[PDB]
Amino acid sequence: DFHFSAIFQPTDPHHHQTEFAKVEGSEKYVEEVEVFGRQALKVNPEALTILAHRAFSDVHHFFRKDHLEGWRRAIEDPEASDNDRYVATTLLKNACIAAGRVLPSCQDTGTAIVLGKRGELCWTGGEDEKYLSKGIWNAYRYHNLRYSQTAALDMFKECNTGDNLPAQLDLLAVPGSDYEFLFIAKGGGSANKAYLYQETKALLNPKSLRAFIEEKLKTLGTAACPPYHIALVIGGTSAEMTMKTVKLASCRYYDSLPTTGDKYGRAFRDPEWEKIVMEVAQKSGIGAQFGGKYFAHQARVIRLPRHGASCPVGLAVSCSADRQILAHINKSGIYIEQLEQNPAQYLPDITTSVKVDLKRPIDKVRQQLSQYPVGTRVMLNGTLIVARDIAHAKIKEMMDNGEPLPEYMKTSPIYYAGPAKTPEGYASGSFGPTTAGAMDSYVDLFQSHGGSYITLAKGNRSKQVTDACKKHGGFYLGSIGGPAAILAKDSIKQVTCLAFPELGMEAVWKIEVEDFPAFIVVDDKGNDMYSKTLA
């Protein structure tokens, strides 16, 4: 009566539906042998370095077709809002810049994640983690990417690792003699929008599940640069298994799963509820960051088995920096997924913004902004003072010790961002905004001390920021989230380090910008352009 049933039964387990390119000459890294009557493959571990290096280079300059098609859909759909089309056009133009292979598509070049599946008879010498890490190290060291990993010297003392290591290296033991991979360059903002819910059987009916989906999708907000690939996993054998599944679902790794369950508890994709997720996302009005229909590119819904007493649920997104790449090593060499190298083909063949001069007293800038309602698009020209999470924490710590808010926090709008490395001969590397919500706890304090009256970042913010701006006559401006390469190429004209150089990308910078687009998200009157869609 025993019947083994693997939980995951893809019809395309080796991803034949994906197009791959062979690394030229790479068959020299492999050798077919036979031991004890079984076919095995000897792999020079240098192949893992070569592969990881190319993967974490390619993925920062090109996108998959299904991602690019989503931006085109947002441009061509009559039901898309004007802001939907504007945002998607900006992201497509950014992708065209990134395809130049100099600037990465986002300043957050992400955490390096490797899902590896090493066959029983695939023999590497066993030092896979080191050789993969050397390839990741190469990609981030010798290209214009960013070192984003923060080491803990103790519970609270931190430093940047300076090389974007350590990677997340999940190497699985599987049948056969090949080595198969999914590489992910996972941005922090979308990683933060991976949520775990501990639910019950009471959720598992159509009315409760739809209400749940409507409630939770809003908590994603715009803080991870939509349009999103939305992934929803219902059930699972443990919290960690649910969350791993929702990550992989968001990378479209489970697209070939069956679409029906069985009495053995196999996983399945649920197209009916994917359509419902898309309807909820579209009808939400949240839109592609600034109101409209294109909150989501597409949706993936996986139903999993569960312990009778349990119902873990996972919700996660892939952001505008949608970065994954499949690969495999076999008897013919190294193969790597082919991404779209001509994103410009997705762009169409075919008095809308307020010019804001920042080279004025900051009180003059506040006065001009006060004339306009939330949702007004502005174009910024002048100096921004750049500071995000660690710089804000350090400045608050100084003030807690009796020191004043530094003067450089009062002269210019505060841009929450951390730049990638500067290409030779460029004024700036990729330099888009970080998530605004992480700085929310500092706004009222800083404004009470005469600074941070105007902030510039991306994402909806908490009510304390709306209240602070109303109390102190402040504003929060929402940059487009994601278009870091076109901002650097076209808008950022000069970058200088002003304070805290030891923080790396998290130092305080003074930058000069031109034609920098943003929306007035929070005004000085209690208004918030997300108050209706994210209520």
Added chain:
Amino acid sequence: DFHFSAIFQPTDPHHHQTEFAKVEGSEKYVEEVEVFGRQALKVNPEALTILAHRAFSDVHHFFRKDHLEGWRRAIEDPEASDNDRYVATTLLKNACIAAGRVLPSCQDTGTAIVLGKRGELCWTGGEDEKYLSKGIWNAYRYHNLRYSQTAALDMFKECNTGDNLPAQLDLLAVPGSDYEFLFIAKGGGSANKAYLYQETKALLNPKSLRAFIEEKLKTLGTAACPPYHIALVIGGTSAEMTMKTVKLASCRYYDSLPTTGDKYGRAFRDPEWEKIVMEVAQKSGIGAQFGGKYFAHQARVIRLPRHGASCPVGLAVSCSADRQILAHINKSGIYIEQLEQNPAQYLPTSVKVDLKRPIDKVRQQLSQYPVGTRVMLNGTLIVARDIAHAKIKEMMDNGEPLPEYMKTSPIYYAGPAKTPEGYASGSFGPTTAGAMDSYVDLFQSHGGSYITLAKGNRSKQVTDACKKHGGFYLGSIGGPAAILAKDSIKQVTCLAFPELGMEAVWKIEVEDFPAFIVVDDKGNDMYSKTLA
């Protein structure tokens, strides 16, 4: 220059600190060979079946020393409350029964989880998941365990798989030629108390982190049968990595990690903050289920690297059914962690309630006492949990009456393990009450569920319901499923929905069934102070 640094650098990666017994004759399943100048191991895959079968049999009848030592500490501590000692004594006596190898220590024999680490040159034939699953199937089929896995035929239509499969099989590729394992029989209740938080740099200071810990520990409540092994993971490279780490930390799998960080971002255990967690747990007053000092056995705190923009945080517990077993296969055969087979060495006022009356008489008697009163129940209980409640709500939504069996007796939220031959009942302890909270006001408004019996603190809607309708919630001790079956449960009958397996509605006759009045008919809740 490039310097590779593994995130996890245990000083005891092969768990030499654990004692193992070799399965007799198991050297016949392995053969050491030498291929292209390197040492390799041929493993007959039947070894995986034998090993998984023994692991998921042993683990339901014995515990680790550090778990048992915690129960003794709660009994012997002068600062423990009377309820601390009562619960810990009950759990130890339950372990003594489970050590007889007939009744499992808990009715929830858990989800079968396998963490496997197969060396590059360990050759099994590659069908590891099937052979491991067959061993798990054997353990749950041929022993007095429970089938707890619920398959989704579609998004909402469900059925029990009838064999406790599928298992969670996480098989990793590692260096060498051995095969190393951690087997976990993970209860649903403690699995439900694995939480993920998305935090920021604003958390990473002593004042904010301590307040955060105090806040989140309370949300564990008593719903996963404390004393807890509490695990806290600060940071991580992804949510799933943070949650896998906190699971393993709760199994004491990472006990040998370094205790200092470095500029390469290595993981470390933080003993200073483990002590702070234990201090918060003790000062909370939550206690071993019913108030006191022994909310927690011990604590593990692991600090992980993080993306600059991110700070995932994981919190998870191991419950009273603390069930994990390390194992490895090498050139000498199959080795399995030795658990404590003589738990008895760790061992050193109530109101009689007759249920064989009209339920209004039982409600009247219970109304005479405050919350915190210990009661002993004698008579019929009607047993129903998650799916049965959902089916009954659906019936009433379709105009049908609340069934008679929800109106005659206290409702025991439980699902039994299989009955041993010649026994009146298999292991039969309570399930978590909170999952049924959304039904209480509805059912009471329709004349039933006035008295419920389970374990764990409940939400305010249940307190309001019991005050509005004159109801009560009784808290059984959580965990002691074998001694409850041996001593209290005299007759078991399937009443309705037999297709639900353990989740069917049961009618059972009990004697000397202990419980506390947790919620009364007046708005009181014995957790209102500690879990506010």
